[PDB]
Paper text:
Rspo (R-spondin, also roof plate-specific spondin) proteins are evolutionarily conserved from fish to humans and have well-documented roles in a broad range of developmental and physiological processes resulting from enhancement of canonical and non-canonical Wnt signalling. ZNRF3/RNF43 specifically targets these Wnt receptors for ubiquitination and turnover, hence reducing Wnt signalling responses. Direct extracellular interaction with Rspo proteins inhibits ZNRF3/RNF43 activity. Here we report a molecular level analysis of the ZNRF3/RNF43 ectodomain structure and its interactions with Rspo proteins.
The ZNRF3ecto crystal structures revealed a distinctive variant of the protease-associated domain topology. Two β-sheets (comprising β2, β1, β7, β3 and β4, β5, β6 strands, respectively) splay apart, accommodating an α-helix (αC) at the open edge; two additional α-helices (αA and αB) pack against the β4, β5 and β6 face of this distorted β-sandwich. A disulphide bridge, conserved across species, links two structurally elaborate loops, β3–β4 and β4–αA. The crystal structures for apo xZNRF3ecto, zZNRF3ecto and mZNRF3ecto showed no major differences in the main chain conformation. Comparisons of ZNRF3ecto structures for proteins crystallized in several different crystal lattices, or for crystals containing multiple copies in the asymmetric unit, consistently highlighted an acidic region (N105-E114; residue numbering is for mouse sequences unless otherwise stated) within the β3–β4 loop, the short αC–β7 loop and the extended β1–β2 hairpin as flexible elements of the fold. Our crystallographic data provided independent structures for multiple copies of the ZNRF3 ectodomain in eight different crystal forms. All but two of these crystal structures reveal an extensive interface (average interface area 992±109 Å2) formed between two ZNRF3ecto polypeptide chains. This dimer is conserved, and pairwise structural superpositions yielded r.m.s.d. values of <1.3 Å (for 275 equivalent Cα pairs). The interaction is twofold symmetric; strands β3 and β7 of the ‘subunits’ abut face-to-face at the core of the dimer. Intriguingly, these structural features interact in a parallel (cis) fashion consistent with ZNRF3 associating as a dimer on the cell surface.
Author numbering:
A (entry chain A): 54 to 104, 110 to 204
B (entry chain B): 54 to 104, 112 to 204
The structure:
């Protein structure tokens, strides 16, 4: 099932009223994860960063995968990476699998013991759109639907 | 459209790992707001108080007898937009003591809010409020 992702940028005024800019994206839910919506602030984690460096409960991990031959022995599989994130309070995880499309099977290999939070992958222009904000922008919220 | 609400309590671990306790309850979407899911930290707002906050919160607002606030600053529908104006990702109203608020909300039906407005009552607001009241930090997940 397809996942609609929204990345929201926001400025307060001095008065306290907020002003937001939404960008829409389409990815897919992994069967490694629940098929629920989730929303929460974005944390960019390196894949080397998933093996008390704590973050507030309910963040949305955005993770750009590496060429797979640039990682002979991963500390964890991409499955275990998402599972780690969750243990550390990730409300959801989003992988950019543009460099590592084998990863989709690896995720969907874990459908026997799925996580109660959503694991979403994105490729192509929808990943491009995502990472371009996550990199440039200060600080963002993500909403994942349906 | 009925709304399923999970309230989440959580504790980090010596190892930086979280442990959660989730309490579920059922409420309803108002046609005055969008029928979408939403998640966010809970901020308890006092009704007088919607006439300072991190973007993406979920407002929990307990209404009171309309006999006791008889010069209201905004309609209850107004209070919700105000909350959204102030970064609320969704608003939850406990309408146990002002049941005619259902009516006001679902009357804004024709011109709605981008975010969800949900009303709860009875044993479901009792659960929600019995957590929110005991000043912990909590997360709210609202599900369509």
């Amino acid at each position: 099932e397809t996942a609609f992702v929204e990345v929201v940028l926001f400025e307060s005024s001095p008065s306290g009223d907020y002003t937001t800019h939404t960008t829409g994206l389409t990815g897919r839910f992994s069967r490694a994860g629940a098929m629920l919506s989730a929303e929460g602030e974005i944390v960019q984690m390196h894949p080397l960063g998933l093996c008390e460096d704590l973050y507030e409960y309910g963040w949305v991990g955005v993770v750009k995968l590496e060429q797979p031959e640039l990682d002979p022995k991963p500390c964890l599989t991409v499955l275990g990476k998402a599972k780690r994130a969750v243990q550390r309070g990730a409300t959801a995880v989003i992988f950019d699998v543009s460099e590592n499309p084998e990863a989709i099977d690896q995720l969907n290999q874990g459908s026997e013991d799925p996580l109660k939070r959503p694991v979403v992958y994105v490729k192509g222009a929808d990943a491009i759109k995502l990472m371009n904000i996550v990199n440039k922008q200060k600080v963002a919220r993500a909403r994942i639907q349906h």
